[PDB]
Design a protein around this ligand. Sequence first.
Ligand code: MG
Ligand code: MG
Ligand code: MG
Ligand code: MG
Ligand code: MG
Ligand code: MG
Ligand code: MG
Ligand code: MG
Ligand code: MG
Ligand code: MG
Ligand code: MG
Ligand code: MG
Lengths: 199, 199, 199
Amino acid sequence: MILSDKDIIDYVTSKRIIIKPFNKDFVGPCSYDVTLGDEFIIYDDEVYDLSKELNYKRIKIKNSILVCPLNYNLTEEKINYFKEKYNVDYVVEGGVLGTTNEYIELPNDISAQYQGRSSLGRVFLTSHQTAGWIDAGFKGKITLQIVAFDKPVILYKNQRIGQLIFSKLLSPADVGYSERKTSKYAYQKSVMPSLIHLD
Amino acid sequence: MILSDKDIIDYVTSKRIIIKPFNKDFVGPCSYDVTLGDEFIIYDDEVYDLSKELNYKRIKIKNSILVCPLNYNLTEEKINYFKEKYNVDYVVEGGVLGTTNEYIELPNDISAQYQGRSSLGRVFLTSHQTAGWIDAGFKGKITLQIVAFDKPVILYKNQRIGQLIFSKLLSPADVGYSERKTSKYAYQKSVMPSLIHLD
Amino acid sequence: MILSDKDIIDYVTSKRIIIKPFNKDFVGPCSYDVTLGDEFIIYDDEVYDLSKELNYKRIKIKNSILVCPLNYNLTEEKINYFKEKYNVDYVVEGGVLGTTNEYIELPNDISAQYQGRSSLGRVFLTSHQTAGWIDAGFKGKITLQIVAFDKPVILYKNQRIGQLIFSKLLSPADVGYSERKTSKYAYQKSVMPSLIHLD
Ligand SMILES: [Mg+2]
Ligand SMILES: [Mg+2]
Ligand SMILES: [Mg+2]
Ligand SMILES: [Mg+2]
Ligand SMILES: [Mg+2]
Ligand SMILES: [Mg+2]
Ligand SMILES: [Mg+2]
Ligand SMILES: [Mg+2]
Ligand SMILES: [Mg+2]
Ligand SMILES: [Mg+2]
Ligand SMILES: [Mg+2]
Ligand SMILES: [Mg+2]
């Protein structure tokens, strides 16, 4: 059962659901709109070997970034062309990890689902690989998984990137995400690599 | 809380939920099956600069279309080969936008989620980039975002392309999608480009 | 309305929901964790013509598999290099179909949604094309649709690959998935090709 506008405000006011920073104009009919943080991570190894710690680079943009589909085959000359033509701070290819500005906390009876805005979907830019359910009890910013699938897309710092949809659990969870000792991503504060090698 | 077959029929009968055109055999255990319209849009610029109006081409198929994965690198000679070999009206590469035949209206206490049929998913053809939640209050056909991820796929006009799953809001929304002055896509009547440059 | 840990255990104990094999440590706040079976299917035709029976190959891994993004353009020499360097049993490109170890049965008032683990999503490995709703009444293992979108990824037999999220229907379905004569995928026992050509 999905929380509507006035439910979102109710839960936020009482601090049953935390959203920092919260803004009321981002509340929609049944979702909260989230915004693109300025920090990205790009991975650096030949293959993802999930049993190893993964090497990465971080970037912090000032205004904007060009995300290219994989196998756009970026040369230095191409990167430079795009930078001059479109005034973007960085050009990247394939997968890039980002983060929401909003930090969120969920009680043990609410579960959230992250999805990308349909305006982005309509330019074939996804900000999540999977269905996007955050666990009851979760604390942290949300890590985005950004891939473009048709042509390069310019994203701007702080733009609305997607939305959270909150729903009621049938019963509250005994252990929220934050409480579970094994939880990898509790208290996220920026964009954060995969830790699957802690499974 | 998800509407089952008999709930879908109930809401439709009373016109609490509109689905034009409605067909009872498309009602399944907990979803309504939707069909592929004949109109597509393909985008035409080098990059998606979300702050500009985007250039596009429209196509209207008679029977079928071949959707290729990106970087299938289509030459005229290849397009011709596929057209002769498979009798398709058009061959396209990467992202293509489509539309459902069904126009839908949602009340302020129902939210819908569009997903693609698992038979298509099993040939690596997606018809949505994001998680697919339509807002409570929405009016319009649904724009599909079609990408193939393994090999080219033939889609036929009017085939069942995916499904709507409807769920109850905890409380009705104060402003439905259609009522909000800023809503971009209310009353959709075909496939429709992205308007993110109106954010 | 989403089932929490203790709801999952309740439904399982009474055999309202079947999960074979069931393991209690895989129960999380509001989901059940599922594991990667050892059998995959790779498709073999130039294009997916949904009105034909599709040709495929099957593979059974001993330990692990390297999934490459499409257009990694795999030569025999490259396949051999990856096999020696990473000790994987198979190297594949683009889409590959897999299966969960868990066989599941759903009653007519519960619907499940499959999603991939966020740890995989963070390495741009998806295990489903579409939103992932299983119908009320469904019986079978779950077929995965695996694609990597940034760099090749090593998956291991029996690893946790994703999760099921279960929710309550507003009303029970008159016909569960298993009961419907037209249902394609009831009683799945491994990974299974697409049957869309039975529509
Ligand atoms: Mg990358
Ligand atoms: Mg919106
Ligand atoms: Mg998923
Ligand atoms: Mg998704
Ligand atoms: Mg295209
Ligand atoms: Mg079906
Ligand atoms: Mg999404
Ligand atoms: Mg999706
Ligand atoms: Mg393949
Ligand atoms: Mg988890
Ligand atoms: Mg879908
Ligand atoms: Mg999805």
